[PDB]
Amino acid sequence: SKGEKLFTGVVPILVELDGDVNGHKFSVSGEGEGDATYGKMSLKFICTTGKLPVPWPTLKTTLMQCFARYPDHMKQHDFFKSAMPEGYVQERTIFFKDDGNYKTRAEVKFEGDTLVNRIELKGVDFKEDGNILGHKLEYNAISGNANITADKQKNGIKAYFTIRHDVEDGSVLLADHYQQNTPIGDGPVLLPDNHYLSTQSKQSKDPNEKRDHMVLLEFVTAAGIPL
Secondary structure (H helix, E strand, C coil), X not given: CCHHHHHCCCEEEEEEEEEEECCEXXXXXXXXXXXXXXXXXXXXXEECCCCCCCCHHHHCCCCCHXXXXXXXXXXXXXXXXXXXXXXXXXXXXXXXXXXCEEEEEEEEEEECCEEEEEEEEEEECCCCCCCCCCCCECCCCCCEEXXXXXXXHHCEEEEEEEEEEEECCCCXXXXXXXXXXXXXXXXXCCCCCCEEEEXXXXXXXXXXXXXXXXXXXXEEEEEXXXX
């Protein structure tokens, strides 16, 4: 594969999410730019249906690991770019401790020069008086590691990690992520040695934006193999 050559410059990003959580339906759209040379994504997401019925932080991991910076010595472990431009399917289950779960399915692919992330999200067994449907989570930055492993049987990768969401009562809401990625195309892909993606995030608002929205500046770096 020569998928990595598609990311050497600034790439426009389009995101589309259709969600249903305990029957509360919503849509999100997002745009921005990825600059994988520096591991960077600059993004803005809008709830297109009015008020988001779950907190923005709970959707962040769902709303493009193809934009990670793999250091030169780790290039042979970058499944995400190797699958381009045909793309990959990303599936997760996210278990919120003592609350419901999200089941997600996404297709991440190029549509001409645009990297498009099209997502379906289904959430069930949430508590209406809980920290999620009750909107009791802090609007702050999520940072941390995604652990990546080869899935030889599916010619893809699996990932796992736990996000710690701050609750406005000073407690923490744990969100256990289980991830599977499979190439959409039939061509060759890179199957990695074990490693992780480290994300640094800055979360903000646009003071001119009336719509329910999220602004992110993300930097994502591959790590866990020396040299």
